[PDB]
Amino acid sequence: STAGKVIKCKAAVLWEEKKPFSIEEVEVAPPKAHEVRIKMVATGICRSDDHVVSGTLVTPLPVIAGHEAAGIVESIGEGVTTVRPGDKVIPLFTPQCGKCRVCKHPEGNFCLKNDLSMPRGTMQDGTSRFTCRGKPIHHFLGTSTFSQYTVVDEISVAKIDAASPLEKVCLIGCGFSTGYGSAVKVAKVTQGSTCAVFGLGGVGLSVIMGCKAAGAARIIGVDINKDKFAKAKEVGATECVNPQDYKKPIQEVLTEMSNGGVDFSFEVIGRLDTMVTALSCCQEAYGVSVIVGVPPDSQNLSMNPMLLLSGRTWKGAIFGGFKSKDSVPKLVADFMAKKFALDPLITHVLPFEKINEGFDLLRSGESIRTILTF
Amino acid sequence: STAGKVIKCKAAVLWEEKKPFSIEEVEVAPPKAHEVRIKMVATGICRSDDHVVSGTLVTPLPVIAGHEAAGIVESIGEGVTTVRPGDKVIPLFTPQCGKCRVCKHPEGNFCLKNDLSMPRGTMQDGTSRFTCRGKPIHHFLGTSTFSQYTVVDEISVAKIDAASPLEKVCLIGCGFSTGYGSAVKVAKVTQGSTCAVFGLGGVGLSVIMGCKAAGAARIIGVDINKDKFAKAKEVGATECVNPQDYKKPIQEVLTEMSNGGVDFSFEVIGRLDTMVTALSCCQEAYGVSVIVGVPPDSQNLSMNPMLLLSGRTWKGAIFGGFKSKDSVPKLVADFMAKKFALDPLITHVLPFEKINEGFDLLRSGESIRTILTF
Ligand SMILES: Nc1ncnc2c1ncn2[C@@H]1O[C@H](COP(=O)(O)OP(=O)(O)OC[C@H]2O[C@@H](O)[C@H](O)[C@@H]2O)[C@@H](O)[C@H]1O
Ligand SMILES: Nc1ncnc2c1ncn2[C@@H]1O[C@H](COP(=O)(O)OP(=O)(O)OC[C@H]2O[C@@H](O)[C@H](O)[C@@H]2O)[C@@H](O)[C@H]1O
Ligand SMILES: [Zn+2]
Ligand SMILES: [Zn+2]
Ligand SMILES: [Zn+2]
Ligand SMILES: [Zn+2]
């Protein structure tokens, strides 16, 4: 029907920092070589999208944001082989080009073609496929999922099982994989181990599920909001601790409770102080602490390097350490085989045109995850 | 001859902080159960011994310091099985009790019976075996090797090959193993990789040798003293860089030279700023930076956690990550089989009674390592 033609559809456009998203009629050019055009079925609202709004995550404006989605391939440009029209897909904010020294490395996943480091707001060829009233609109992280239709480079899209439910599995595009991979791929949580998870929003819940899939014996959820504990326990936390209940510092409580420190700690709040507390509460000799997110305007933290010298390991990663194009389809296969449950993460579902309401829910802390549906 | 009796010999005693060592006549009690008395053959002067002098490394005084040595077993207390009189040995400042949760762990080596964390200056049973004119003298790290004879717990001593030359292999007790293990056990340097080593004193040379044994392709030595480069190249550095030669920051030079950052960086200066530079110069996606020493009075460092979020790993360790009682005898076997060379590390050899001269050489930077011989 619409292959090789411009498509007019609606998108949420951010014209300037600190303003609401405007629903606009936009033109979406046909995909050029190695590009795929996708019809969006559902998209998650993530913190990172809010950082674009606030000017924290610097990216050229005006922009169509959104990076956590699923959809259906509408058409493919010249020389696309990995996907076909009608295939279900997940766009990847971390590409997997397969060629660079990161993609060749057994451990790396932060592909050198990413648009995160020095953002240009373009496709890989350096132009945009979006216009609004003749004016070009930037892409975001080579995904731009706040549009009924989007164009993405083939290196940034993963084919998933034909029978997948898209309203759930869009979370595999960011929040779930980030948390789950942090435990299963970055930390390599072992059977029988003790884990502590600082922050019980969506990504901390996903870390907990990863710790549980890896066979942790004890998983201690830490959060200053007691309302988060009920869901943390439902997905696998064996205990929950609220640092405001104590007279002593939380790392001293966690070191007492785990008889000398936890095997794996995970920082998923994004706060400087809690990064350092998380490192300290892991066992001095062989503890691993993983930093799951960092706000993109963070200052320096302050840390005594003696924490590392006994044998601790501090690490970070993007997208849970997963090589994106390889892993996403296998995570979706595991969901289809019922190995984990995404529904506890989904607290609100809104139609796309209520995007600004979605962001309010995110800003206020009522939501674990809001999904927008098209 | 002297088994089961007190032995009168000479030791170097530190009576107060910031004063020279006094050579004193001391009494060395016979070993009680699971203790070994050793006749010292040679002992290294290490930085850590100077930190005791300066009051940086807090330990009870008066004390017999020294922890890097080799010697010959003079007698064994009740229930010692791992060693016999006449066996060549290396005392271990990191014990290996075999029982605790660290010794049971495949990765840990900082045994919970160490005397480094909360120092008591005693044997494991809580008393001393040294007196000077009726006054008790503390032990240091359960070793105290600045004495013609010392008593150490069996968990702190390793039996080595009978044919070993003790004047060389005493370095296996601290400096060499720390550097070499940092590359071979903590970083797990891989074949073909690029490594950067900040600091080309004794331990940095040992890191270089570890990188070379592991098959690194390029090993970049970094040091502000150009006189260190000649030996760094002799043991395996492929290139040497002096940061004072440049107008730009060293991590930017190292990132240019290695086409996007090194695989493994090692900080072996002990300085805060250079810890952070070392982390930054490793590849963002899969780089590993290892902190080899920390001065025991270090302040906090200041660091942007964004360095970790792309995929870098920061780690530290004591004694090169090696389980001490298992590893020392195999390192000595490798020396005996000619797999590495300790002689480039040994720049000065002094008789024990010139200990204060040894420390001057260490304080001035003339020495790579001074060995004291008895
Ligand atoms: N000092 C604190 N100690 C413990 N918990 C805290 C503290 N301050 C805030 N929190 C809790 O941290 C949690 C933050 O959760 P969300 O804001 O829902 O965030 P989520 O989508 O999970 O991710 C937050 C962001 O931080 C990054 O580490 C992570 O990758 C993500 O980008 C909340 O449950 C909040 O109560
Ligand atoms: N800013 C700098 N940049 C690079 N090199 C430096 C700098 N400042 C000092 N150095 C160099 O660092 C080296 C320190 O070497 P030594 O003092 O001989 O120390 P060594 O016995 O090898 O160990 C020093 C201590 O630091 C710890 O990391 C290590 O484990 C040991 O405890 C010297 O070669 C010195 O020139
Ligand atoms: Zn790549
Ligand atoms: Zn996200
Ligand atoms: Zn032990
Ligand atoms: Zn030492």
From Swiss-Prot, chains A, B:
UniProt cross-references to PROSITE patterns, sorted A to Z: ADH_ZINC
Listed Pfam families: ADH_N (PF08240), ADH_zinc_N (PF00107)
Ligand binding (Zn(2+) 1): 46, 48, 67, 174
Stored SMART domains: PKS_ER
Binding site for Zn(2+) 2: 97, 100, 103, 111
EC number(s) recorded for this UniProt protein: 1.1.1.1
Any one of the GO BP annotations: retinoic acid metabolic process
Protein's name in the database: Alcohol dehydrogenase E chain
Organism name: Equus caballus
